[PDB]
Amino acid sequence: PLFDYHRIDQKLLQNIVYDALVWSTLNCLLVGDKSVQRSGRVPGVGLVHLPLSLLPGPFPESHWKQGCELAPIFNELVDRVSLDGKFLQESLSRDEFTSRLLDIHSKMLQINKDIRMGIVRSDYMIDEKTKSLLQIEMNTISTSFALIGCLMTGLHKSLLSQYGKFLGLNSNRVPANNAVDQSAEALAKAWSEYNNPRAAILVVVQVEERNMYEQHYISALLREKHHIRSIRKTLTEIDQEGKILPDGTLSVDGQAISVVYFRAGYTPKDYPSESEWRARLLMEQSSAIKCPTISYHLVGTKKIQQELAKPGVLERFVENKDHIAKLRACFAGLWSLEDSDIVKKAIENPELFVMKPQNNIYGDELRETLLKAAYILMQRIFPATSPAILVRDGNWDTGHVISEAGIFGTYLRNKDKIIINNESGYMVRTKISFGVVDTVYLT
Amino acid sequence: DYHRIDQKLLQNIVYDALVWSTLNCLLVGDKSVQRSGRVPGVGLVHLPLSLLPGPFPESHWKQGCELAPIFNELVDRVSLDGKFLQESLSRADEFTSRLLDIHSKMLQINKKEDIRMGIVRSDYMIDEKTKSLLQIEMNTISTSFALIGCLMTGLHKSLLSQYGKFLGLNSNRVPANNAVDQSAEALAKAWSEYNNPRAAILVVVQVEERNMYEQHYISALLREKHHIRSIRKTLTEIDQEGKILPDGTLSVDGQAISVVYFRAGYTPKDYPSESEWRARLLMEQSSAIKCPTISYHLVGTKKIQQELAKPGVLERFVENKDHIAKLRACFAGLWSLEDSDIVKKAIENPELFVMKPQYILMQRIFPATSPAILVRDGNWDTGHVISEAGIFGTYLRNKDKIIINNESGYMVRTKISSSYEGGVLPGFGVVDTVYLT
Ligand SMILES: N[C@H](CCC(=O)N[C@@H](CS)C(=O)O)C(=O)O
Ligand SMILES: N[C@H](CCC(=O)N[C@@H](CS)C(=O)O)C(=O)O
Ligand SMILES: N[C@H](CCC(=O)N[C@@H](CS)C(=O)O)C(=O)O
Fold this sequence. Notes:
The structure is a homodimer.
Chain A: H1 12-26, E1 30-32, E2 47-49, E3 52-53, E4 57-59, H2 61-82, H3 85-92, H4 96-109, E5 115-126, E6 133-139, H5 146-163, H6 179-194, E7 200-205, H7 212-225, E8 230-234, H8 235-241, E9 243-244, E10 250-252, E11 255-262, H9 274-285, E12 289-291, H10 294-299, H11 302-309, H12 321-330, E13 334-335, H13 339-347, E14 354-356, E15 361-362, E16 376-378, E17 386-392, E18 395-414, E19 417-432, E20 436-438, E21 440-442
Parallel strand pairs in A: 4-21, 7-8, 7-11, 11-12
Antiparallel strand pairs in A: 1-2, 3-17, 5-6, 5-18, 9-10, 10-11, 13-16, 14-15, 14-16, 17-18, 18-19, 19-20
Bound molecules: gamma-glutamylcysteine (3GC) (3 copies).
Residues 121, 139, 142-144, 206, 209, 211, 214, 263, 266 of chain B line the site of one gamma-glutamylcysteine.
PDB class: ligase
Keywords: Dimer, ATP-grasp domain, Ligase
Assembly: dimeric
């Protein structure tokens, strides 16, 4: 144990936790309590610290470097796949939700309708077999925790400033984070690119938003730092409110909308009725720059990401061989009816493989294979468990947790000028065995 | 006249204020949540606030600001007169005289406090005839709301940047407020005069503190800005955990303490037993800088606060006759060691004065009213309210060297009551700022 944090004497942790709880209040590491009924609609009431790991867990410096250089590679890959409507339409037209999303994509295709931007997130985990950094998810739409992840960097750096050498650790190895500034800056640059100085930013939000303070903070940054107004509306409000003018400008609550920032619309529970599908359509048709576009949203679906990971598919959207190499190194293997992996690599050694739907099947039952629900074959990831202190509604407890590190990218282009393509900070979600937020403690 | 504002627009401002409050830690423990005054980060709620500032003449603002060093210097002087204080408060309620006790014990060992400081607050009203700024109270000890006041300034400037247009108001006109930074600064310079690099600041704190964030924020400036450490402890923790070192240094929980910052101990309720009275005496006898000493507590009590106000008393502690004019001007008529101005000019016109048949005697305070929006537990309502302006002062000196004597930001306290929907506490009222002129 190098810091198996469970060892730390229970007297010194009453104090660290105490300080951790102070800092979170002072710095708005706060969310609506689930237990309080209005805390997702009324700000300023029913507030509570984000559930949190007290001290950061370890992540090799090299694999953190690796994730950092992937960030702009994934950005350009997401833009490239999104430009292929036939790949997208072929792949996915095989789920009422997805099929509704594809409609909207078709409609645009049908109508030949660029300033393109993204604020996206690639989630990784370290795998104990290969010792590799592996991509777990690419989030192309409405990525949370740009603020949270970067208050956490601050929290843990504070804690370590106070308690470090008393524990063997230096804040230095909690990496610097700018996720939320990069985010608001990507937005401000897009608004600039549209070059309507009268335009506001639309931020599409959920009816119930306990995490509303992350959003207000980005809006505060936009307003005070970038001098740009933003307005927050639910999809059903955009259906009642929103109009397109005869020249294709979006007008929501009496103002031009140059940028549409989604922090909603990624779940089917966001579209209770036809009003919300109208609104998504209305907005997509408009000349507003969408953060992100419907094509981007589709790239991010489970189905597209699986298809990307199959042998030879990825390499269709990437010409750079160094990048090709980098991508494939973080991609967990995934396959269909290949006799070679999928009869027999997996039959002998059912150890990795898991079969998943396009129940999971593992281990001895994965001799499903000996007989040819779970439609594709992929490589098993074995995660790093580590001892943690978990602070929740003011109370701590110990557990052994796994961590998922997500790297933000921002991207902005106007037909062939790349204005932004960036690694833009991180967050970490740490969970038992929906968990807590965290950081990493490099190598 | 904010009651005259379209109700759905009002709801937009309140929504923005709630949001700003949350982002910028204008938060306390919710009274409704029982752990919230002990456990940080749980059960938070925004401060009750006035949505938007009442008007305040600018001339009277400047008047209240000029007066802060002058009250800073007067508190200190009265405090130096142990015999006066002793004359005026032997009379009695048990708490006041348990403070005299401790005062006598210090005069007795002829105790020396070479470095003296204050973080104090003069609370004022504009009275709606004569149009004069009048002192309501002089708070010498444990003055709350330096963070909260200067947050309220941020709030109202931000709302006015958004809405002031429509409204006809410029954010400009809400006075700039640095209360919390000047608070930490005074404590920083104090630690620095004392000159023990390894010493911490002790903040003396109530068992239950829903306003703890104000205190932690001050400790964060101390720690991050000034690189000074602090610990918090209740009076009974000090009794259990502290002691005087052979050279006189205070040591609490094995830490040397150079500065004792009172955020508790101004109410009998802070002394349930003889533990906390020990703790109070122990720190007084030590050589730690008290913020404030026992003499300053005394200068701010009801009985003394009245005594200076009566005619003549005030000349004994002030030399500058301007400063005597400034003080008399915000001094409201104050009387009775025997006066024929009692019940005379007072049973006959009792709508001015206060306090005889019909704890002594003042000119009556007729406050300006303004329509206001009040926000409490995420809910707003309209209300007609009165405001009380608190001007902070910071003072520090080392023998004859005045290191700091200074006006240091403000708070405003605004409440409905008497002619409308309430009940007497203030229901601590709400937090406010002012709009000049
Ligand atoms: N309710 C929004 C929705 C955003 C969201 O669901 N984000 C997912 C991204 S799809 C995440 O874990 O990033 C929030 O928490 O800010
Ligand atoms: N709990 C104390 C309360 C101290 C206090 O109530 N101060 C009052 C009266 S001395 C004030 O209005 O300043 C704090 O916040 O530090
Ligand atoms: N409003 C602040 C001033 C802070 C202060 O003391 N303000 C009074 C002078 S006391 C004022 O007239 O603003 C400013 O505008 O700079």
